[PDB]
Amino acid sequence: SAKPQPIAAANWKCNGTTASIEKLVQVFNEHTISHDVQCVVAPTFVHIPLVQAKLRNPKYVISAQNAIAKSGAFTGEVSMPILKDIGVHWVILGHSERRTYYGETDEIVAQKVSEACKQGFMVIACIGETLQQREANQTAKVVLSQTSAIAAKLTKDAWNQVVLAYEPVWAIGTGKVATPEQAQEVHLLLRKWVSENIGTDVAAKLRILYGGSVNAANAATLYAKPDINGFLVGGASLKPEFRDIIDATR
Amino acid sequence: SAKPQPIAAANWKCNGTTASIEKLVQVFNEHTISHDVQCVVAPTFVHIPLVQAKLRNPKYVISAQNAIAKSGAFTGEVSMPILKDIGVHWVILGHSERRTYYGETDEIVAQKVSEACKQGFMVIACIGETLQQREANQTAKVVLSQTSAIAAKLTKDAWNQVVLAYEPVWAIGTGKVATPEQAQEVHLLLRKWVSENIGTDVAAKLRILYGGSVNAANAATLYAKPDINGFLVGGASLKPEFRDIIDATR
């Protein structure tokens, strides 16, 4: 077995001040990372320029938390060509909070992911089941339907730019992290589906991250499973223990 | 008659590159404004820091195109405390495109406007009727219902921070500007409602802007009407003729 390159991604969500972000970024700068891992920080749109100016650790790239495909008459939104023009070419799409609060259905997410791939982004595409779907034994059907709705809009080559993040909705910000065994079963099920429907060569390379109440203590155990390639981290990524989350992908 | 201080507001919507924004801002900097008018520029979230760094004309303030009330687990969004912390204390709320595409009902807009007022923002609150409501002779009922839904969440003192922008939906970006007579009838109807329901002292001071295909040629005629206090400008605010829009409020 050899895993692909791991990703440790910080989703700051709608949080931060200039003061608190300058301290955290200094913490990240001074942490020396000695293994091959892609680190990702996703600040709010307004903080992108501050983080670009301060972040110096060569293992990091900056991501946006959302975008729309095209520039134009969309008051309030930020487009993919605008992010590219300021030097951001990662984006998180179809996070649970957007699917729930802000009306992003599978079709909308799939369209965004496809456009992002056409425009050269690296995409972190989020999927996952609610507690009601999990109790109804629908987990597999839900995550596979969300995944093939995205697959439907993509070409084989575009899977090089795609990272999947499985985040059970009941684990996000609740403190109730999935067990390593729960997460591994889903990750294995996804990798298999990709290997059968897209290609074995695509499946071998695909990073599939776990997210939902990851912290510095439980990270190392989740990362020991064979189909977990790293993490999407909310709450714990606003703290200095994000360093030991990164170091748990060694 | 004496009008309140006029406002000329540029809503760039989801447009701009670093290069095109640096040129435009230079144009605005070099235009000397010799009368009392509050100018407002509303770039995308990502461009706020670039515009703060370059914009030097003392008649301008920077606005956000949207916000949510509170920081927290809202991937993709930007909150009112975050904007205040970077020195932005104007916001446009309940623009047509948000009400239409992104599910902002009257209650959601009213909650945002109320929170923004509590947090000390100057708010540009947008209302207006569609072409179907206008043909059904519902204009007055629609704009008054949108306005009293906001009024319901406010206290009398909070009206000092509120600017209303009437923008018929059929005039936005279409090229089909309302006539000075159409706009004046609505603006008069709104001022009267405020004078009766909130206070005559509030109504005298309230800025009510017109928006919807304003350009440098038609601005001066709209501004000659007694209840029009300036403009919210989309398409024409991305061009150097925004200078003569500003100068039409003399």
Instruction: Dig out the tokens for B219 from the structure.
Output: 């601005």
- Phi, psi (deg, nearest 5) at residue B181: -70, -45
How was this one solved?
Answer: X-ray
Which of A161, A171, A152 is closest to A125 using CA atoms?
A161
Helix (H) or strand (E) holding A92: strand A90-93
Q: Which residue has the tokens 């009293």?
A: B148
Helix (H) or strand (E) holding A233: strand A230-233
The conformational region for residue A233 under phi > 0 = left, psi -120 to 50 = alpha, else beta, is beta
Q: Collapsing DSSP states into helix, strand and coil, what is residue A100? A: helix
DSSP, residue by residue, A119-187: TT-EEEEEE---HHHHHTT-HHHHHHHHHHHHHTT--GGGGGGEEEEE--GGGTTTS-PPPHHHHHHHH
Cα A52 from chain centroid?
19
When divided into structural domains, chain A yields a total of 1
Cβ-defined contact of A85 to B18 (cutoff 8 Å): yes
Count CB atoms within 10 A of the CB of residue B198. 18
Residue B11 among known ligand-binding residues: yes
- Phi, psi (deg, nearest 5) at residue A2: -130, 130
Instruction: Assign residue B236 the CATH number of its domain.
Output: 3.20.20.70
Instruction: Dig out the tokens for A59 from the structure.
Output: 């293992």
Nearest-5° Cα angle at B88, B105 to B78? 45
What positions of A carry a catalytic annotation?
95, 167
Burial state string for A107-117 with b = 16 or more CB within 10 A and e = fewer than 16: ebbbbbbbbbb
Cα-only R_g, chain B: 17
Instruction: Report which residue type is found at A161.
Output: Q
Instruction: Report which residue type is found at A167.
Output: E
Residue A11 among known ligand-binding residues: yes
In this structure, are residues B8 and B40 in contact, taking their beta carbons and an 8 Å threshold? yes
Instruction: Dig out the tokens for A24 from the structure.
Output: 């955290």
Cα-only R_g, chain A: 17
Taking any CB pair shorter than 8 Å as contact, residues of chain B touching chain A are: 11, 13-18, 44-50, 65-66, 68, 71-79, 82-83, 85-86, 92, 95-98, 101-103, 172-173, 234
Out of A14, A48, A73, closest to residue B74 by CB: A14
Domain range enclosing A203: 1-250
Question: How far apart, in whole angstroms, are the C-alpha atoms of residue A176 and residue A206?
Answer: 26
Question: How far apart, in whole angstroms, are the C-alpha atoms of residue A16 and residue A22?
Answer: 10
Question: How far apart, in whole angstroms, are the C-alpha atoms of residue A231 and residue A211?
Answer: 5
Task: Choose the catalytic residue: B97, B115, B129, B167.
Answer: B167
Instruction: Report which residue type is found at B8.
Output: A
Question: How far apart, in whole angstroms, are the C-alpha atoms of residue B113 and residue B127?
Answer: 12
Instruction: Report which residue type is found at A38.
Output: Q
Instruction: Dig out the tokens for A75 from the structure.
Output: 């008051």
Cβ-defined contact of B46 to A74 (cutoff 8 Å): no
In this structure, are residues A53 and B50 in contact, taking their beta carbons and an 8 Å threshold? no
Nearest-5° Cα angle at A112, A107 to A117? 125
Name every residue whose Cβ is closer than 8 Å to that of residue B224 and which is 6 or more positions away in sequence: B180
Question: How far apart, in whole angstroms, are the C-alpha atoms of residue A185 and residue A50?
Answer: 39
Question: How are beta strands A60-64 and A38-42 bridged, if at all?
Answer: parallel
